Structure formats: C-alpha cells, structure tokens
Amino acid sequence: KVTTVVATPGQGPDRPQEVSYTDTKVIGNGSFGVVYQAKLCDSGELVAIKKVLQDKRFKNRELQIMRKLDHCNIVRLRYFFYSSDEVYLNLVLDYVPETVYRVARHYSRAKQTLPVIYVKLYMYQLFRSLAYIHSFGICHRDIKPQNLLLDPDTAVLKLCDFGSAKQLVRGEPNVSYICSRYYRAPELIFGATDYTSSIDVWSAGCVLAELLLGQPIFPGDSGVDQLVEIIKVLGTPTREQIREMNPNYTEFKFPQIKAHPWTKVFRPRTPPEAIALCSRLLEYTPTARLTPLEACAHSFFDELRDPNVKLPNGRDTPALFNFTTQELSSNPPLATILIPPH
Amino acid sequence: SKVTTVVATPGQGPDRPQEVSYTDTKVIGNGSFGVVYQAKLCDSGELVAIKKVLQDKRFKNRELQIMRKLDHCNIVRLRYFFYSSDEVYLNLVLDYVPETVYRVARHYSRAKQTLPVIYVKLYMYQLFRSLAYIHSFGICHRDIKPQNLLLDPDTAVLKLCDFGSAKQLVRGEPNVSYICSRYYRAPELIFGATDYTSSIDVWSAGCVLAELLLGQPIFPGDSGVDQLVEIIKVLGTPTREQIREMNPNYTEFKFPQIKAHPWTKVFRPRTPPEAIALCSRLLEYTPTARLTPLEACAHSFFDELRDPNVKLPNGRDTPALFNFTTQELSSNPPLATILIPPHARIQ
C-alpha cells in the first residue's frame, strides 16, 4: 500500500513535490497526535511522519520554527503536508533509530552504566543544538531523554519535538506549565511566568546527571517531591535565590536541608570534570547556569577534542566542530577552545 | 528477624503511650518522604505500616498534627507514632491495608477487564466521604491519587492515606501551587494558582472516577502542556471567565481552540449515564462550580449503594456507608434526606 502526498520541502523555496511512501508503521502516540514511520519510495530512506491537528486560527508555530531550523543536531524537517471533518498538519521528519531514553533504560535494566565517552558525545551535541536554537532566542521547553534522538552507528544525537518550543521575548510572559517531570527547572515548578532559556540548560543538566547516575537525579510525580529531591542535593535555597526564581514564593515552608557534597551524589568512579559540569548546570539562580556554548567548551568535553579520539565501534567521531558564526554568537572568543587544530 | 520494642504514643486519644513491639519489618515503599515499612505487631499479630520521616528541628510535624485530629472509617488509622534515631525521625505507625486502587485498577487493565461498576460506586463513594469529612475541618489533601487510596478487597472498604501534602486552607493565605501529582492536578494547579480551594481534591477524585470507568487515565501527559491539551480535548477551550476563575494572568494566552467533546462519547458504550454525569459535574473548569464532596456522595450514581438489598459479589455485606456524624454533614445537613436511606433509620 503506497501513499503519494504532495509535500512542501522543509527548507528553501515553498515548492511542493510529489512524495511517495510505503510500509507505514506506528512509532508513537502523544498529546499532539500520532507519529508514524514510513519508507520513502524515491530513496528507501526511512522517515518519521508526525500528524498534528491545525487550528484554523493561527499558523502552526512548530512548523514555523522547524522551517527555520538548520543544524546537524536538530531533527531535519524533510517535508510537511496536509491531510484529511477537519485538517491535520503532517511533519515528515528524518527517522533516527534510537533515543537517549531507550538507550539509557537498556543500560539501566542491565545494571551497568552508559560509558562516559557516550555521555560526552551525546551531551556535547545536546548543548550544541541548544546553543543553536538559543541564539535565535528559541527555547525548547521540553528537553527530556525521549526527545534526544540517537544514531548508534554514527553517535549522532538529534534534538526533536518542537511542539512546546518558543521564541522568548523579554517582558512578554510565557506559560509556567511546560517541561516534563524530573526535568522542570525550579523556577518552573514555582510556576514562574518569566523564566529564561536557561530552563533548557537546567533540563540538560538533569539529563547529564541521569546518564551518570542510571536514574533521574530529581524524581517525583509531584512538584513537591521533585523540589524535595532537588534540595537534598543542592541544599535549601536562599531568600536571594528564591527571589531570582519566583517572588512571593519567599517566606514559605522549606526543608532546612544542608547542601550535599556533589562528589558524594555519584558513583566513586565518576569523573571530577563530569561532576563539575553537572554542578554548573543544576544551579538555583537561572543566570548562574552555564550557557550551552559555555558548556560545550567545558573540560568535561576535552576528550572529544583529542586528535586521536575514535568511536567504540571503530568509526570516526561525528561532525563536532563545524560551528557557524551564529552558533558562536553567544561568545565568539570561545571558538579558540571549541574549534581544535583538526 | 529481630523484635524491635518501642514505647510509642497512640494516635487518637490522650497522650498515654504503650510498649509496642514488632518483627518481620520489611520495605513497603520509598519516596521523597523517607521509607515506608511493613511490620507484624507481636501483641495482636496485626499487620502494620511504619512510615519514617526526618523530623524538622524547627517545628512540630504538620502531617502528625493533621493525623492526630482525624478519626474516620475511610481515613487510614494512625495506630501509634514515635521518634527514632545524626538527627531524629518520626515514625507514623499506620494500620496495614493490603491493597490500593492503583494496584487493583492495574490488574483489571492488565487483564483487559474493567472494574465492575459496583466497586466503582462503592470505592468512589467512600473517597467522597473522607473528602467531605476532612474538608469539614478545612483540611485539603492536595494529593489525591490511586496510590493514596488503600483498599481491603474483602470488605471493600477504602481508606485515604498520605497526608504528607495536606494543609488547612485559610482564605487569603497563599499555598504552593506545585502540590498534587501527574494526571490528577486540577487545572488551576497546572496554571500555578497560589489561591486554590479544596475543590482541587474534588477534581482529582473526578479523575480517579473517570480512570476506573475508562480503564486508563483521562488526562495523561508528563507535562502540564500535554495534560492541558487532554483536558481541553474533553472539556473544550475554557472561556475568558473560566480562565480568570482558575488564574488571571493566563486570561490572555494562546490556547488550543477545540470545540467541546460530548461526554457520552468520552467513555465506553456500556458505561452508565449516571457515572458519565457525576464526572462532568466534578471535572469543571470553574473551581466554585464542582460538586461538594458531600453532594457527590448524594448523587444519582450511588443510589444503588443506598439500596437495602445491595450485596458484595463475595456475598459479604457492604461496609458501613451511612453512619454520618454532624461534623461530616456540616457542609450541608439537609442532604441527610438523601444520604441516610430509610432502612438506615430503622432501629
């Protein structure tokens, strides 16, 4: 059963082509709608098609964002088209085989940890996509393992699901209730309406800790649980620190819990540089958190820049250094540290 | 197993502590709070649940203060409490109930069956009694979920536990928005409201009903955003007024504009219309518009429970559902007319 749509290419001139595909299987189902997988006939290439209803009201924000995104660490919008009494928008994405979520559980359920080089490789690439999408002022707002697509042959990581993503204007308020449990920044948990893009790097640091721990660092199915678990690690926040998250949440009842030594929250085998980076990401005051670019240039990732670093399967490391002017606009002097001799 | 012998203070009653001793102590659960153990009391042989928590140096424990004031057949019983040994830890010795709505519901879902409407009626009713009872003190549970609903499956008695999140709600005093758990958060909580009423409990209870009737959660999602798209996909987009009644400052955001789904088509085709209707009256955007728990008890959907003939499938009789104190009824005393059926007055 072959299906032939008239799809608009994702980038470049708004010029539709006939696109055929077969072997439709279902890969996922979420609040948005369903995510199918199909094989393109004119290539054999496997794509993930994602159907989502389109309100007649305004244009689709995800499409508008995905249509402007061009980066080797963001899932590529191959095409998009419209299908059948109301109208769904179908985003044709490049299919990637695995995910950080699936990969970690595997290791988790085998009781052995994901090897650090994969943490370096996946985390570096994550912060790269962030440094990218941030530079447009675009906050993802749902960074979680299930959104970090993973090609195990190439070690390529790709960020996806821009359903919740948004360009943050300062003074223009946004909903508190974005981001998934375990990964919400404290300012979100406190319902702050004026968070910055640093909620994404908070979340990212939660992913790092998890890949190191083999379980989420801040679990709980309530905001209260999560907050308690944060405090058992970062310590009871201060008045000055509650302020920089969400005012009027000062002078509430909080567990007078003393800060825990970061090195004693991880396996003893764990790298000091890894603990140190993790430190500078999971920070109460949202401005004191590393910017994604800054993170990329962290000592934790220095292995990645060795001339003779190769992937465990023999292959060469993926394209880690092709930074562009814009990707480095946060802090252009960091290029001296992020782009090595080769 | 060793025997631990402690001099614990009993929950209800004057502060007259007893030597209590127990063996077989074994982990029943772990969470943010601390550990929850099961032990066997040497005196009775009775099975108990011990809940260990670090005691804050600054103040008397809130949970204990709330538990020591509660006494109802549908709220878990604080048998004893005591302090243990670094810092100091409170132990809440609770009576052990063998099941939870969480686990029973999963069995059915796992077997691809649904919980029989009679049990849905029985359990939902008992949940609303405890809610009506604790609300009566001003106490709001703020964490109603299937895991906090213990069951004895033989006697079909349901008990509400985990008062870890519970607060007495004074109007004009703010409360943290981030209580309540994934799937059961009322919309004004999703919206980060600091001024909510105990109607959040009625919203959670509405979810549980829907879940038992659906065989799965009705507003799933790991994010507030996902959860709200699910709530809307049923209720429809909330009006400006409806947003301002959950939380002003959200009145001018860009919400999905989906037209409201008919409730009859949001459930299984055999599902009784009385249940479909209790839901719609609990799952309302406007917080002030939801049934009082006591109004819920007194609702068409539980009229079977008020039948003198009603028997449990095992042949045992129903648990005591009509022994209403004035404290419980204080919300709305004339609803006794409905609540206490004729044969419960024969004496």
Curated annotation (Swiss-Prot), chain B:
The broad enzyme category this protein falls into is transferase
Q: Name one GO molecular function term.
A: kinase activity
Which tissues does it occur in?
Expressed in testis, thymus, prostate and ovary and weakly expressed in lung, brain and kidney. Colocalizes with EIF2AK2/PKR and TAU in the Alzheimer disease (AD) brain.
What are the disulfide bonds?
none
- Calcium listed as a keyword: no
Which residues does the record give as ATP binding sites? Answer: I28, G29, N30, G31, S32, F33, G34, V35, V36, K51
Q: Which residues carry this modification: Phosphotyrosine?
A: Y178
What regulates the activity here? Activated by phosphorylation at Tyr-178. Inhibited by lithium.
What happens to this protein after translation, modification-wise? Phosphorylated by AKT1 and ILK1. Upon insulin-mediated signaling, the activated PKB/AKT1 protein kinase phosphorylates and deactivates GSK3B, resulting in the dephosphorylation and activation of GYS1. Activated by phosphorylation at Tyr-178. Phosphorylated in a circadian manner in the hippocampus. Mono-ADP-ribosylation by PARP10 negatively regulates kinase activity.
**Localization (cell):** Cytoplasm; Nucleus; Cell membrane
Query: What's the catalysed reaction?
Result: L-seryl-[tau protein] + ATP = O-phospho-L-seryl-[tau protein] + ADP + H(+); L-threonyl-[tau protein] + ATP = O-phospho-L-threonyl-[tau protein] + ADP + H(+); L-seryl-[protein] + ATP = O-phospho-L-seryl-[protein] + ADP + H(+); L-threonyl-[protein] + ATP = O-phospho-L-threonyl-[protein] + ADP + H(+)
All copies of the Protein kinase domain together span: 22-302
| Residues of the signal peptide | none
Keyword Endoplasmic reticulum assigned: no
The family note in this entry says:
Belongs to the protein kinase superfamily. CMGC Ser/Thr protein kinase family. GSK-3 subfamily.
Name the job this protein performs: Constitutively active protein kinase that acts as a negative regulator in the hormonal control of glucose homeostasis, Wnt signaling and regulation of transcription factors and microtubules, by phosphorylating and inactivating glycogen synthase (GYS1 or GYS2), EIF2B, CTNNB1/beta-catenin, APC, AXIN1, DPYSL2/CRMP2, JUN, NFATC1/NFATC, MAPT/TAU and MACF1. Requires primed phosphorylation of the majority of its substrates. In skeletal muscle, contributes to insulin regulation of glycogen synthesis by phosphorylating and inhibiting GYS1 activity and hence glycogen synthesis.
Q: Which named protein is this?
A: Glycogen synthase kinase-3 beta
What stretch of the whole protein does this chain cover?
35 to 385 of 420
